[PDB]
Symmetry: C3
């Protein structure tokens, strides 16, 4: 898939967490988010489509997705312990990175 | 360095997990698999030994290994919590991913 | 931060864990270490100043940092369970990896 489909998947699952009721929906949505971030790691953002795949910008893109993946791991650890409200609070932080990375690499 | 030795290690530790009696053997084999996958991250498969290290193929290679690493993390989290049967079942999700990465990139 | 600042962060937090008393300091220092390693993944060590970011040396550099990250996660899990002594023992292995990385890439 392209980078934009993965962006849309992240946003949709973030809203799903925003509306979630129990811990299972949070776990499933954050797992889908992890998968979408791993997939987006293989994509080229539009702003970097004219750049070397070996450029430092591509490296920084991928390592930023690594940082996001580790924050997602933290949120998933919170959700696996049944912490619904804290998983949602942590996901509210994920949003400020997902939308930001969206606004820059657009 | 060598893709084949690490793929071996993966298969052998999968067998060890399947034939394991307690959670400790599962944990140890999963740690060995994690080490082998991290090592294979640096390798170049023969199907791509004629491609550039920044090519999309190499990127997909390394990111598929990251995906395998997160699957191994899930299995290890299961094993640490004492759910041996669910950990083995999750390791049965690892055999298919390992085999696909094998056939496609070997 | 640069490469040197991140390595100094890693060292400082290593000692903090080493002389900590409760689990909270251990988890705080290990979280600092995780952030520092993720940031250093985007760095260019002095011995690789002019090599391409997609060079095999740089790929091995980033994968060594991935190994460090997974060890950091293991220590963080041991500390979150309350096993402070096991966490510090695991962080002793963290010191080995950090110092080897500094001795090879300085
Ligand atoms: Mn974990
Ligand atoms: Na890379």
């Amino acid at each position: 898939a392209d980078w934009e489909d993965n962006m849309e998947t992240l946003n949709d699952n973030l809203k799903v967490i925003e509306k979630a009721d129990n811990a299972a929906q949070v776990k499933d949505a954050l797992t889908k988010m992890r998968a979408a971030a791993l997939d987006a790691k293989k994509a080229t953002p539009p702003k970097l489509e004219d750049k070397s795949p070996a450029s430092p910008e591509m490296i920084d893109f991928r390592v930023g997705f690594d940082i996001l993946l580790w924050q997602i791991h933290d949120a998933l650890c919170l959700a696996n312990e049944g912490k619904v409200k804290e998983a949602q609070a942590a996901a509210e932080q994920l949003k400020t990175t997902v939308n930001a990375h969206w606004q820059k690499y657009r």
